[PDB]
Amino acid sequence: DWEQYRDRVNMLQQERIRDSPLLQAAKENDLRLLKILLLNDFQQRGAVGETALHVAALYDNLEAATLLMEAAPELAKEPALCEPFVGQTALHIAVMNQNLNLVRALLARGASVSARATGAAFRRSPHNLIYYGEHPLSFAACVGSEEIVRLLIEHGADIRAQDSLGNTVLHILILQPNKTFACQMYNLLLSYDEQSLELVPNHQGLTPFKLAGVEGNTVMFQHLMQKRKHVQWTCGPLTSTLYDLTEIDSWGEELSFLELVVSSKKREARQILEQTPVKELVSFKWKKYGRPYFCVLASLYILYMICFTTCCIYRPLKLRDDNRTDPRDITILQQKLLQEAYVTHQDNIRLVGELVTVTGAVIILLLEIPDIFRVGASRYFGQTILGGPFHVIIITYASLVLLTMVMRLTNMNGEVVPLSFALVLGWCSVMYFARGFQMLGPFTIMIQKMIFGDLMRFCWLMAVVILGFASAFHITFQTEDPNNLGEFSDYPTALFSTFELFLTIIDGPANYSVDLPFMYCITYAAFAIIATLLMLNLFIAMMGDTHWRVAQERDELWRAQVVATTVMLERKMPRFLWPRSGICGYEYGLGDRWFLRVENHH
Amino acid sequence: DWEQYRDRVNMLQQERIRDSPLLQAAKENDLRLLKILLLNDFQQRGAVGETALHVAALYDNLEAATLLMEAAPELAKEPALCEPFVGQTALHIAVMNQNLNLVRALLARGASVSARATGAAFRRSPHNLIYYGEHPLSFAACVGSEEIVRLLIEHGADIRAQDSLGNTVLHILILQPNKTFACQMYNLLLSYDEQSLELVPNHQGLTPFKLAGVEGNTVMFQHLMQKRKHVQWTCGPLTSTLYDLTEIDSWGEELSFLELVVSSKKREARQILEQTPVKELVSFKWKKYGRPYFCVLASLYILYMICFTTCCIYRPLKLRDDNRTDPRDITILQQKLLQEAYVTHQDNIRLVGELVTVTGAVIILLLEIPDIFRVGASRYFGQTILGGPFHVIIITYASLVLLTMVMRLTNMNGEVVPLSFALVLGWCSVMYFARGFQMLGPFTIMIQKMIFGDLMRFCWLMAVVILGFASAFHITFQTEDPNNLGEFSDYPTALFSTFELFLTIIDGPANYSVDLPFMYCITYAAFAIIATLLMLNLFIAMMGDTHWRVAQERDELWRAQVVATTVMLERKMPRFLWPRSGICGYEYGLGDRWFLRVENHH
Ligand SMILES: CC(C)[C@@H](C)/C=C/[C@@H](C)[C@H]1CC[C@H]2C3=CC=C4C[C@@H](O)CC[C@]4(C)[C@H]3CC[C@]12C
Ligand SMILES: CC(C)[C@@H](C)/C=C/[C@@H](C)[C@H]1CC[C@H]2C3=CC=C4C[C@@H](O)CC[C@]4(C)[C@H]3CC[C@]12C
Ligand SMILES: CC(C)[C@@H](C)/C=C/[C@@H](C)[C@H]1CC[C@H]2C3=CC=C4C[C@@H](O)CC[C@]4(C)[C@H]3CC[C@]12C
Ligand SMILES: CC(C)[C@@H](C)/C=C/[C@@H](C)[C@H]1CC[C@H]2C3=CC=C4C[C@@H](O)CC[C@]4(C)[C@H]3CC[C@]12C
């Protein structure tokens, strides 16, 4: 809807301009028409509450604008009035258009340096092609005009002014597309900070440094670190550099810089983890504490999955309580009742295995469920870097184990169902620990990108081929004796047999002792060419093409998963297992700060 | 044939020139021979009716040509006479050769600016390496000569002159290979238009704008739009531009610009759909109306295919009316007659499912058959972008359902045959709707390019291996008892078993309880190495290589299929479901035209 509305607003602005000789003269730069018309209403408006001076500024007409102020100087103070552009002044427009002389002329008339363009055209949104904040200084910074940024601070513009998101100009600058002035402009604006402006948080709680991390602005991140590094010594090709970890390690805060970076929705935030002080810090944390503890947690989880598997294998079963009648029934055994199920030393050993099994399902829920709420369910389940799909299946596993325990307590039949799903998802969730090892981590990401990519696309077109051919095979065999060829004997079996025949995992139905219907040979030749020969090998060809084009994305995602594991372990484990990282400054007279020392060759 | 004929014409032209001292002097530029020979027939002809002045112009000899006119000025007016070059003048030739002084000399003698070179050498065809139209002005435009184009219009050449295709010079220019003058030359020729010349249609009904769309000339399309855009405002990096949709949306016309573009045979016409106003218009139409309605039509078609499938599953069958005799017969059931087939509430429910099934087959034919005639059967079935092969199978489906209904009404046996083909093609045609979704559309094009590409090439060489080895296996087993190994028991079964063994979809024939002929082990080892190991994996290797080299073509074809779906839906659906797209100019005083407003960052 918003596009058609904005489109109408734009048409309606031009309609009023074209309808009004003052606004047309201001757009056209018709000095002669202004020199007639201004002598005989100056406060008349375009469709959004824009004045003739907004029009003159928009069409970049200094000559018209100086006439309009000479006739009616109060126009320099006027905001626009309607929701798209409300609060916008001719000063915001003169800054957008980089017209230094028109800006200085509006300031000479006393246009407000602190006016907020609060309308919907100025809010960070997918609707807007730019986000310059709401103040003339924020615009002057985002257009890169050093002259206008100085001229506005000379006229009393406040560098610490915040917009409707709480963004100061330093936050607005870090949100810009990477262009050469943006770091120059940040370094200029901090020269007027003489708490510091770069410590002011927005309404998300982000300081400009954390915003650079979340937004993936690696150029601004390196610029921010030039003032947090100290070059300790240089000797020949070697230098020792000491980096202040205060902002990076984010000590004692609920949401850390590293957590905000790994949990960011933006693709570019992974590149912050490859920036020098960050890369060495998370590397140290991983090789020192993270990998050792993750290998222990993997071992404990594998041992727990062996315990659960043993409790499935030794599950309590007795010879069935009724006779089998029809030859098609093969069930011979049956679930024991509670007071039959715990009557031997072997059951008492299985019972402690069941209690360990249930205890671990509770511990999974106690560890997982609080992090759904903190992170938000969309990010907690939806992020490859955090382990999103492994969170879905490990909670499903714990839910199915607790379902199995309430079924057991109730003497409820069919425990084999939740136990089978629990064994599959229980064991498949061991692949969460693949992320700890360079052999297996990148490959586990590649399997994930194949499942949510080429597998769903293949399975939709495969389902349509299966519905076609299974129906053809079923009705081809409906005339025939099902005991002579069973694969297509009823429609559910025909679907299942056709699915197995698509994958070639059962042999092509054959009985050379009998005359099969001629339409089967035809239909199977068409199915063998389309499903088996073409489609299944085209799935190989498709994944082969996807693999080489995904290979770098897979490796970046793996380096990000190691960091997200490191961050998660340190936040969740007891603090005595995670000593504070880097060098304590207090031992060396550097005050309360902590450092990373990096030595490098150049 | 035409090459050998033209070749003879060219040899015969040179033969006459070499035979005739006047024409040889005109080619050679032998001024001294002309200064002897011209004093004592000047109207004598080369093999195609060319004069000595045509020869002098062709060999680019101004000196000879001014002598020939000094002796016989009527030569400037002479056309060539024979079918290859009929109507060609020395003025057409002097323009081809860009000889401004020779052109101005022929015009001083009163050579016709409006002569038509109507012969076969000048017609748009695959025989001709250039198409410059038929008039000297059309040639002057296509050689890019601004001096000669001005000099010809100064001498009264008509810019609106049309050739045998109805092409004006603006159409001829849009047909040229993209070279720097072609837009300059179009912009020059419109400066003499002061209805407009760019509204004149050719004999296909195409104006120059629609011809640029059909021909895929994206450079001329962008040039044409520079005069249909209005830049509404510019502010900082943003601009709002208003594009006139009149030619693009082609409102109320039988064949629209967008339909002519998507239905074009030329590969380059897809690139027009990625040009700014077109791209935003078809995108709006798709996201606003096309995708919603296509998802409904997909749902209704899937529900219809479920209804038909249910009518196949519940088809009316009774226990056979005769005893089975030989053990090889497995048929136990049989088709019911009409007065047996509709006798229960379950049959009455199936009957309304059959009536819905038949009604939908009629509705498919009522929707499809008129579009065969309008589009032409070669384009309607032959285009990947329009859905050509899906039109073939969906009409085959409807034909087989109506065949099945006339069989049913006749009590005709073997309904299983058209029903099986109808189930396969009925369900496979659901993949037509894959084009609506980015997950499935590109992949459905890739399956199509594999079927008509690497699959036919593999299936021809596979058939030759199957004929070889099936014959070897059959005659190897002819000596042996068919009840001990059935796969090769007769030649049709040997072919079918060999085809299934090629694909590995049945197991290698084995019976370890008996002595198989030694020639079987040899022949199967050769078949396993050639068919299974080599050829079938070479099919995987081949499609893998085809896939990466086709991947971009596949994605362009998908973006074109979304537009062709959008265009088709809007033309076929009721108009109240497709409100006219863009902005009505009449609300804003812009007259009867409709616009797209585009906002962009630069
Ligand atoms: C029990 C059966 C009947 C069915 C219901 C179970 C589904 C299993 C096989 C499927 C469901 C989702 C799948 C799945 C989800 C996502 C990932 C993350 C990826 O990086 C590695 C593979 C992995 C871990 C796979 C493993 C197989 C799973 C767990
Ligand atoms: C990869 C995609 C295509 C997935 C969705 C495919 C699913 C189809 C082919 C498979 C998946 C589960 C299969 C399935 C589940 C269980 C049963 C019960 C069995 O006694 C009869 C067959 C029946 C009913 C089959 C029918 C075919 C199904 C539904
Ligand atoms: C019923 C059997 C015996 C035989 C005769 C039928 C043939 C089927 C299997 C074949 C014939 C042509 C094939 C075909 C034609 C072209 C296309 C377009 C492509 O983009 C997707 C696949 C698709 C839709 C395939 C699907 C499988 C089809 C429909
Ligand atoms: C992919 C290409 C090679 C295609 C054309 C291959 C076709 C051959 C191998 C297959 C397609 C259909 C098959 C086929 C159709 C139906 C029957 C009836 C059956 O009772 C005996 C075998 C017989 C006669 C087989 C013989 C082998 C055929 C003709």
mmCIF file of N, CA and C in Angstrom, chain A residues 4 64 91 98 130 189 211 225 244 260 288 296 330 333 340 372 463 466 483 513 579 594:
data_model
loop_
_atom_site.group_PDB
_atom_site.id
_atom_site.type_symbol
_atom_site.label_atom_id
_atom_site.label_comp_id
_atom_site.label_asym_id
_atom_site.label_seq_id
_atom_site.Cartn_x
_atom_site.Cartn_y
_atom_site.Cartn_z
ATOM 1 N N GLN A 4 1.768 3.164 -3.407
ATOM 2 C CA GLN A 4 0.680 3.903 -4.078
ATOM 3 C C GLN A 4 0.340 5.212 -3.328
ATOM 4 N N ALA A 64 15.523 32.571 -6.488
ATOM 5 C CA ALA A 64 14.148 32.559 -5.993
ATOM 6 C C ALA A 64 14.064 32.581 -4.458
ATOM 7 N N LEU A 91 15.707 24.387 5.333
ATOM 8 C CA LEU A 91 17.078 24.127 5.759
ATOM 9 C C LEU A 91 17.463 22.651 5.586
ATOM 10 N N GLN A 98 23.122 20.241 -0.777
ATOM 11 C CA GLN A 98 24.486 20.738 -0.560
ATOM 12 C C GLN A 98 24.722 22.187 -0.978
ATOM 13 N N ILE A 130 17.076 6.314 1.765
ATOM 14 C CA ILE A 130 18.086 6.895 2.648
ATOM 15 C C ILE A 130 17.544 6.952 4.071
ATOM 16 N N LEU A 189 33.248 15.097 13.637
ATOM 17 C CA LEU A 189 32.200 15.297 14.632
ATOM 18 C C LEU A 189 32.676 15.035 16.059
ATOM 19 N N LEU A 211 26.794 -0.630 17.428
ATOM 20 C CA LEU A 211 26.074 -0.489 16.169
ATOM 21 C C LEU A 211 26.960 -0.818 14.970
ATOM 22 N N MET A 225 38.690 1.357 16.223
ATOM 23 C CA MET A 225 39.819 0.743 16.915
ATOM 24 C C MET A 225 41.116 1.509 16.806
ATOM 25 N N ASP A 244 42.619 -2.096 23.661
ATOM 26 C CA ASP A 244 41.667 -2.044 24.766
ATOM 27 C C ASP A 244 40.427 -2.898 24.466
ATOM 28 N N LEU A 260 25.947 -9.641 20.228
ATOM 29 C CA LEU A 260 25.204 -8.803 19.292
ATOM 30 C C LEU A 260 25.688 -8.961 17.851
ATOM 31 N N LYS A 288 41.805 -21.913 24.208
ATOM 32 C CA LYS A 288 42.056 -21.983 25.653
ATOM 33 C C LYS A 288 40.929 -22.648 26.439
ATOM 34 N N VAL A 296 34.179 -31.903 25.938
ATOM 35 C CA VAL A 296 33.580 -32.540 27.114
ATOM 36 C C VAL A 296 32.065 -32.599 26.970
ATOM 37 N N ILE A 330 1.822 -59.929 11.952
ATOM 38 C CA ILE A 330 3.143 -60.377 12.414
ATOM 39 C C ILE A 330 3.516 -59.870 13.809
ATOM 40 N N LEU A 333 4.706 -59.700 20.136
ATOM 41 C CA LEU A 333 5.104 -59.137 21.461
ATOM 42 C C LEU A 333 4.288 -57.876 21.766
ATOM 43 N N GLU A 340 4.451 -54.891 35.891
ATOM 44 C CA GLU A 340 5.175 -55.966 35.205
ATOM 45 C C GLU A 340 6.572 -55.508 34.746
ATOM 46 N N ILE A 372 15.259 -18.998 24.396
ATOM 47 C CA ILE A 372 14.185 -18.616 23.461
ATOM 48 C C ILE A 372 13.709 -17.197 23.772
ATOM 49 N N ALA A 463 7.263 -34.943 -5.506
ATOM 50 C CA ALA A 463 5.912 -35.290 -5.025
ATOM 51 C C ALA A 463 4.891 -35.321 -6.174
ATOM 52 N N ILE A 466 5.497 -38.406 -8.243
ATOM 53 C CA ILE A 466 5.023 -39.558 -7.470
ATOM 54 C C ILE A 466 3.504 -39.651 -7.500
ATOM 55 N N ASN A 483 -1.695 -60.553 -4.721
ATOM 56 C CA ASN A 483 -0.707 -61.537 -4.274
ATOM 57 C C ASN A 483 0.373 -61.849 -5.323
ATOM 58 N N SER A 513 7.047 -65.084 -13.955
ATOM 59 C CA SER A 513 6.121 -66.245 -13.955
ATOM 60 C C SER A 513 4.679 -65.871 -14.365
ATOM 61 N N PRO A 579 37.783 -17.658 33.197
ATOM 62 C CA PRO A 579 38.539 -16.496 33.630
ATOM 63 C C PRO A 579 38.510 -15.387 32.582
ATOM 64 N N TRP A 594 41.125 -3.821 30.481
ATOM 65 C CA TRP A 594 41.743 -5.079 30.070
ATOM 66 C C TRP A 594 42.133 -5.014 28.601
#
